[PDB]
Design a protein around this motif. Structure first.
Motif, mmCIF file in Angstrom:
data_model
loop_
_atom_site.group_PDB
_atom_site.id
_atom_site.type_symbol
_atom_site.label_atom_id
_atom_site.label_comp_id
_atom_site.label_asym_id
_atom_site.label_seq_id
_atom_site.Cartn_x
_atom_site.Cartn_y
_atom_site.Cartn_z
ATOM 1 N N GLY A 99 -10.917 17.288 -7.136
ATOM 2 C CA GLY A 99 -12.122 17.256 -6.285
ATOM 3 C C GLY A 99 -11.787 16.918 -4.843
ATOM 4 N N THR A 100 -12.788 16.469 -4.079
ATOM 5 C CA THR A 100 -12.697 16.178 -2.621
ATOM 6 C C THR A 100 -11.832 14.935 -2.374
ATOM 7 N N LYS A 101 -11.998 13.887 -3.189
ATOM 8 C CA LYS A 101 -11.404 12.540 -2.960
ATOM 9 C C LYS A 101 -9.897 12.563 -3.250
ATOM 10 N N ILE A 102 -9.469 13.275 -4.298
ATOM 11 C CA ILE A 102 -8.031 13.424 -4.680
ATOM 12 C C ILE A 102 -7.314 14.261 -3.612
ATOM 13 N N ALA A 103 -7.990 15.272 -3.057
ATOM 14 C CA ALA A 103 -7.471 16.136 -1.969
ATOM 15 C C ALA A 103 -7.121 15.267 -0.755
ATOM 16 N N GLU A 104 -8.046 14.389 -0.349
ATOM 17 C CA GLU A 104 -7.900 13.475 0.818
ATOM 18 C C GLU A 104 -6.821 12.428 0.516
ATOM 19 N N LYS A 105 -6.506 12.024 -0.632
ATOM 20 C CA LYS A 105 -5.379 11.274 -1.248
ATOM 21 C C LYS A 105 -4.087 12.056 -1.171
ATOM 22 N N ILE A 106 -3.835 13.209 -1.662
ATOM 23 C CA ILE A 106 -2.743 14.228 -1.564
ATOM 24 C C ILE A 106 -2.413 14.474 -0.084
ATOM 25 N N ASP A 107 -3.430 14.738 0.745
ATOM 26 C CA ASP A 107 -3.299 14.904 2.219
ATOM 27 C C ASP A 107 -2.598 13.675 2.810
ATOM 28 N N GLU A 108 -3.060 12.470 2.455
ATOM 29 C CA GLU A 108 -2.510 11.180 2.955
ATOM 30 C C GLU A 108 -1.073 11.000 2.450
ATOM 31 N N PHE A 109 -0.838 11.217 1.151
ATOM 32 C CA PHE A 109 0.469 10.992 0.473
ATOM 33 C C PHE A 109 1.554 11.875 1.102
ATOM 34 N N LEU A 110 1.278 13.174 1.257
ATOM 35 C CA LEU A 110 2.232 14.178 1.808
ATOM 36 C C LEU A 110 2.564 13.838 3.267
ATOM 37 N N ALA A 111 1.569 13.375 4.032
ATOM 38 C CA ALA A 111 1.671 13.066 5.478
ATOM 39 C C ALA A 111 2.422 11.744 5.692
ATOM 40 N N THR A 112 2.001 10.675 5.004
ATOM 41 C CA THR A 112 2.472 9.276 5.212
ATOM 42 C C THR A 112 3.656 8.947 4.290
ATOM 43 N N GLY A 113 3.721 9.560 3.102
ATOM 44 C CA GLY A 113 4.784 9.330 2.102
ATOM 45 C C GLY A 113 4.336 8.380 1.000
ATOM 46 N N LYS A 114 3.535 7.367 1.356
ATOM 47 C CA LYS A 114 2.953 6.362 0.425
ATOM 48 C C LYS A 114 1.440 6.282 0.656
ATOM 49 N N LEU A 115 0.675 5.945 -0.389
ATOM 50 C CA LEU A 115 -0.808 5.838 -0.345
ATOM 51 C C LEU A 115 -1.204 4.413 0.063
ATOM 52 N N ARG A 116 -2.135 4.293 1.017
ATOM 53 C CA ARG A 116 -2.608 3.004 1.596
ATOM 54 C C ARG A 116 -3.183 2.119 0.486
ATOM 55 N N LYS A 117 -4.064 2.678 -0.351
ATOM 56 C CA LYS A 117 -4.747 1.955 -1.458
ATOM 57 C C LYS A 117 -3.698 1.330 -2.387
ATOM 58 N N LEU A 118 -2.855 2.161 -3.011
ATOM 59 C CA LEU A 118 -1.872 1.752 -4.057
ATOM 60 C C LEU A 118 -1.024 0.570 -3.571
ATOM 61 N N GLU A 119 -0.602 0.577 -2.301
ATOM 62 C CA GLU A 119 0.190 -0.520 -1.679
ATOM 63 C C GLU A 119 -0.592 -1.837 -1.777
ATOM 64 N N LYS A 120 -1.914 -1.789 -1.570
ATOM 65 C CA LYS A 120 -2.833 -2.956 -1.685
ATOM 66 C C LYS A 120 -2.870 -3.444 -3.139
ATOM 67 N N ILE A 121 -2.916 -2.519 -4.105
ATOM 68 C CA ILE A 121 -2.917 -2.816 -5.572
ATOM 69 C C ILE A 121 -1.554 -3.400 -5.968
ATOM 70 N N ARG A 122 -0.458 -2.780 -5.516
ATOM 71 C CA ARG A 122 0.937 -3.177 -5.859
ATOM 72 C C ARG A 122 1.179 -4.640 -5.463
ATOM 73 N N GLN A 123 0.702 -5.054 -4.282
ATOM 74 C CA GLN A 123 0.917 -6.416 -3.714
ATOM 75 C C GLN A 123 -0.022 -7.433 -4.379
ATOM 76 N N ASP A 124 -1.103 -6.974 -5.021
ATOM 77 C CA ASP A 124 -2.057 -7.834 -5.774
ATOM 78 C C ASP A 124 -1.344 -8.387 -7.016
ATOM 79 N N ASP A 125 -1.335 -9.716 -7.176
ATOM 80 C CA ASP A 125 -0.680 -10.438 -8.301
ATOM 81 C C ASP A 125 -1.474 -10.211 -9.594
ATOM 82 N N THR A 126 -2.805 -10.316 -9.521
ATOM 83 C CA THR A 126 -3.741 -10.213 -10.673
ATOM 84 C C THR A 126 -3.678 -8.800 -11.267
ATOM 85 N N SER A 127 -3.820 -7.770 -10.425
ATOM 86 C CA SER A 127 -3.863 -6.336 -10.821
ATOM 87 C C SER A 127 -2.600 -5.961 -11.603
ATOM 88 N N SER A 128 -1.425 -6.190 -11.009
ATOM 89 C CA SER A 128 -0.091 -5.842 -11.572
ATOM 90 C C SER A 128 0.131 -6.570 -12.904
#
Ligand SMILES: *CC[C@H](OP(*)(=O)O)[C@H](O)COP(=O)(O)O
Ligand SMILES: [Mg+2]
Length: 324
Positions: free
Chosen positions: A57-86
């Motif tokens: 859909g639209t939201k995954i496209a804007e995610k793929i766009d970010e990933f290909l451009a930046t190399g890493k996703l902004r959101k996932l980095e926030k989740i990865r650094q979260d102690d509780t989530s991991s």
DNA sequence: GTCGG
DNA sequence: GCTGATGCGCC
DNA sequence: CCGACGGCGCATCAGC
């Protein structure tokens, strides 16, 4: 494979939604989008390109766009650094620990396997076993073993009663090099849908497989289905085999081959076969195959004596378990 | 999150 | 002790 | 714009 980076990102997002966010539908979406992209025979250059595929859909496209451009996703980095989530994401790997128990543990300061071993009193029977064979349950089963495991099950089933019909389904039956677990389908002329069972029909098979020290532990047991742990016989000269998950489902004889079809897989295949049946004017499920009337109402269940019968009813060319 | 009524 | 709600897991 | 997206066997707990 092609686009290994994007698929990993999505599968990581999926796991987060299921285990941390407890949003099962978002998980199934990210999984759907991850699978279709994995089969894609090119390297996605833009999100607008990926959106052309079904399930993206639209939201995954804007995610793929970010990933290909930046190399890493902004959101996932926030989740990865979260102690509780991991921490929550880890515990859910243990069999018997779902998102609910996982969050309850991490909130109570229990985050690692060490903590689970230290607090075994707070675990249920299932979770204790899930911890005991944690590493062993994450090991895949090579076909070489599955064949040796099959022979034990079928023979020991024969040892109790000759009238038993034991069929090992799942990846193994499709002829895969490796399988995740053992999925056994059981039936007996005695057991049908109309005329009910005298219990200790499944029990006798479970009690027999325990007698020969094949089944080690029990996760759940009842009238119809059983879930537990099994181990191949130690060669003595060589080191002992790892512990494997086993499931034994007792099905009525009239609706066995309908069951065998469903539990043989795969998901994409069953989804395609069930979709075609609706086009041909028949409704198939785990249990029975039935005709849809003029008004779209299901009739009485049709007689089935093999997998072929189901393929005949919906005028479909018989596919072999290899091509599923 | 994505799909379809 | 009973009965319904809910977690968990399968593909 | 908004509801559907998996229904079910077994284990466990809440409420009576
Ligand atoms: C990644 C896009 C998400 O859309 P969904 O239909 O779960 C969020 O809306 C974006 O917000 P974030 O999750 O805070 O980045
Ligand atoms: Mg599309």
């Amino acid at each position: 494979t092609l686009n290994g980076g994007i698929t990993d990102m999505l599968t990581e997002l999926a796991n987060f939604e299921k285990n941390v966010s407890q949003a099962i539908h978002k998980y199934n979406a990210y999984r759907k989008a991850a699978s279709v992209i994995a089969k894609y025979p090119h390297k996605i250059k833009s999100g607008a390109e990926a959106k052309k595929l079904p399930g993206v859909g639209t939201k995954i496209a804007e995610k793929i766009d970010e990933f290909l451009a930046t190399g890493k996703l902004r959101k996932l980095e926030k989740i990865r650094q979260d102690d509780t989530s991991s921490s929550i994401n880890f515990l859910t790997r243990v069999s018997g620990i779902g998102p609910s128990a996982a969050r309850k543990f991490v909130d109570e300061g229990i985050k690692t396997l060490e903590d689970l071993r230290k607090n075994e009193d707070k675990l249920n029977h299932h979770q204790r076993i899930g911890l005991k064979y944690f590493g062993d349950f994450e090991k895949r089963i090579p076909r070489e073993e599955m064949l040796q495991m099959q022979d034990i099950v079928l023979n020991e089933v024969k040892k109790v009663d000759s009238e038993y019909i034991a069929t090992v389904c799942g990846s193994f039956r499709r002829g895969a090099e490796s399988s995740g677990d053992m999925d056994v389908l059981l039936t007996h002329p005695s057991f049908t849908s109309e005329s009910t069972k005298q219990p200790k029909l499944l029990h006798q098979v479970v009690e027999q497989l325990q007698k020969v020290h094949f089944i080690t532990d029990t996760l759940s047991k009842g009238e119809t289905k059983f879930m537990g742990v099994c181990q191949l016989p130690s060669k003595n000269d060589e080191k002992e085999y790892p512990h494997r998950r086993i499931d034994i489902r007792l099905i009525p004889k009239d609706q066995y081959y309908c069951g065998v079809l469903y539990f043989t897989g795969s998901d994409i295949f069953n989804k395609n076969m069930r979709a075609h049946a609706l086009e041909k004017g028949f409704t198939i499920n785990e249990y029975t195959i039935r005709p849809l009337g003029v008004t779209g109402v299901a009739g009485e269940p049709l007689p089935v004596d093999s997998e072929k019968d189901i393929f005949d009813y919906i005028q479909w060319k018989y596919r072999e378990p290899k091509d599923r």
